[PDB]
Chains A and B, each alone.
Chain A
Amino acid sequence: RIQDLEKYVEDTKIDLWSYNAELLVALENQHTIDLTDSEMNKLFEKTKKQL
């Protein structure tokens, strides 16, 4: 009984941390891409409004 539970705790913990990690990367990248693209899009607009 106890061993079944001791495993199920550390197991279901690893799951929840694994999901939180995958989501963080995807979320984290999808944002990294947007900041870099937008910073260029700002440079284009900064030049146009200047001309």
Chain B
Amino acid sequence: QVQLQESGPGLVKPSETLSLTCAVSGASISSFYWSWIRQSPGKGLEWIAYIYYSGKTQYNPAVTGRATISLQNWNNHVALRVNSVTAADTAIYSCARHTLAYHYDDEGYMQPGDAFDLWGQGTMVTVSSASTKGPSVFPLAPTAALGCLVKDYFPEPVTVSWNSGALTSGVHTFPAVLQSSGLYSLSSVVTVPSSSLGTQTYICNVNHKPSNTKVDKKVEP
């Protein structure tokens, strides 16, 4: 029952340093090799670097030496800083576990594994210079359907659940779209039976982590 959750900023001004951590759960960070991998629109799927509590570390050459992987023991996190960010560096950044190697190296330490065991969801980092803008959630009311609408919100991603994540079936979180203003806007709907249109209350949970803004709206005809 080991899990990863990558905490990160939403945007980063170009030519600046980017701070990143991912939290590990139910397992000591020192027990396995960890590496970061980032997915980007274009330029394939790119491994950056791996780490081990020994100190052994390899970086990818295509990313200049600006990236430096650390790992921290107090918070049980594995971290990653990359300085002098360019526009190309925008991507989702995930941390992942190596398969234990089961054969030591020179000086006794375990080698990095030949496979990535499990991945975290990841966090979207955006290389922009505009100011982050908070969202605004206007509900839309009605077998029928209802949902929330997140409008003109700028940091790249946004999570939306219903009733603290209770409502599973019939939900569909839609991809956002760029308005000509320059601010994205998503909107998620949910199909529900009409017989409880005033019986079971419906409160969607919109969460915009890069703006530190979590807003829960409600739906009523």
Q: Let me know if chains A and B touch directly in the complex, using CB atoms closer than 8 Å.
A: no
